[PDB]
Amino acid sequence: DNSTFKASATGLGGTDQKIDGDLKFDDTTGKYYAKVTVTGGTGKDGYYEV
């Protein structure tokens, strides 16, 4: 569920922060990485460890 990222990651700022829809996974560490679009944040769109 991608909704709880918006309820937990309040320090990102902007106007509306949301994951692009699909969570990212790796081939080395198994770490979850969220593809985050931060509307209102100057250059904050990117991938975040989650």
PDB file of C-alpha atoms in Angstrom:
ATOM      1  CA  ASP A   1       0.000   0.000   0.000  1.00  0.00           C
ATOM      2  CA  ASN A   2       1.492   3.309  -1.131  1.00  0.00           C
ATOM      3  CA  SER A   3      -0.773   5.531   0.992  1.00  0.00           C
ATOM      4  CA  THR A   4       1.097   5.214   4.308  1.00  0.00           C
ATOM      5  CA  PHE A   5       4.210   6.836   2.826  1.00  0.00           C
ATOM      6  CA  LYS A   6       2.225  10.076   2.657  1.00  0.00           C
ATOM      7  CA  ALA A   7       1.104   9.651   6.283  1.00  0.00           C
ATOM      8  CA  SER A   8       4.624   8.938   7.582  1.00  0.00           C
ATOM      9  CA  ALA A   9       7.079  10.966   5.448  1.00  0.00           C
ATOM     10  CA  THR A  10       5.918  14.424   6.488  1.00  0.00           C
ATOM     11  CA  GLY A  11       9.360  16.062   6.382  1.00  0.00           C
ATOM     12  CA  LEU A  12       9.599  15.967   2.585  1.00  0.00           C
ATOM     13  CA  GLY A  13       7.647  19.210   2.207  1.00  0.00           C
ATOM     14  CA  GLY A  14       6.223  20.504  -1.043  1.00  0.00           C
ATOM     15  CA  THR A  15       2.482  20.264  -1.649  1.00  0.00           C
ATOM     16  CA  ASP A  16       1.837  16.532  -2.085  1.00  0.00           C
ATOM     17  CA  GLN A  17       4.270  13.616  -1.808  1.00  0.00           C
ATOM     18  CA  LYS A  18       3.330  10.258  -3.314  1.00  0.00           C
ATOM     19  CA  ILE A  19       4.944   7.107  -4.652  1.00  0.00           C
ATOM     20  CA  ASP A  20       4.712   6.707  -8.420  1.00  0.00           C
ATOM     21  CA  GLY A  21       2.813   3.436  -7.933  1.00  0.00           C
ATOM     22  CA  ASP A  22       5.285   0.538  -7.784  1.00  0.00           C
ATOM     23  CA  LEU A  23       7.763  -0.165  -5.001  1.00  0.00           C
ATOM     24  CA  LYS A  24      11.351  -0.899  -6.012  1.00  0.00           C
ATOM     25  CA  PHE A  25      13.449  -3.871  -4.914  1.00  0.00           C
ATOM     26  CA  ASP A  26      17.117  -4.755  -5.289  1.00  0.00           C
ATOM     27  CA  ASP A  27      19.259  -7.761  -6.167  1.00  0.00           C
ATOM     28  CA  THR A  28      21.895  -7.386  -3.418  1.00  0.00           C
ATOM     29  CA  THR A  29      20.355  -6.298  -0.095  1.00  0.00           C
ATOM     30  CA  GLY A  30      16.605  -6.874  -0.386  1.00  0.00           C
ATOM     31  CA  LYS A  31      16.001  -3.264   0.649  1.00  0.00           C
ATOM     32  CA  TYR A  32      12.714  -1.594  -0.244  1.00  0.00           C
ATOM     33  CA  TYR A  33      13.060   1.617  -2.242  1.00  0.00           C
ATOM     34  CA  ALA A  34      10.119   3.911  -2.966  1.00  0.00           C
ATOM     35  CA  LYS A  35       9.841   5.798  -6.263  1.00  0.00           C
ATOM     36  CA  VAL A  36       8.663   9.108  -4.802  1.00  0.00           C
ATOM     37  CA  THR A  37       7.341  12.149  -6.646  1.00  0.00           C
ATOM     38  CA  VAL A  38       7.337  15.157  -4.312  1.00  0.00           C
ATOM     39  CA  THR A  39       4.999  17.774  -5.777  1.00  0.00           C
ATOM     40  CA  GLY A  40       6.149  21.147  -4.475  1.00  0.00           C
ATOM     41  CA  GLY A  41       9.713  20.040  -3.733  1.00  0.00           C
ATOM     42  CA  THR A  42      12.467  21.555  -5.864  1.00  0.00           C
ATOM     43  CA  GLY A  43      14.390  18.547  -7.168  1.00  0.00           C
ATOM     44  CA  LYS A  44      13.174  16.086  -4.515  1.00  0.00           C
ATOM     45  CA  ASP A  45      11.722  13.552  -6.982  1.00  0.00           C
ATOM     46  CA  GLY A  46      13.654  10.306  -6.743  1.00  0.00           C
ATOM     47  CA  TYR A  47      14.151   7.033  -4.912  1.00  0.00           C
ATOM     48  CA  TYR A  48      14.116   6.771  -1.115  1.00  0.00           C
ATOM     49  CA  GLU A  49      15.064   3.877   1.148  1.00  0.00           C
ATOM     50  CA  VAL A  50      11.862   2.707   2.848  1.00  0.00           C
TER      51      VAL A  50
END
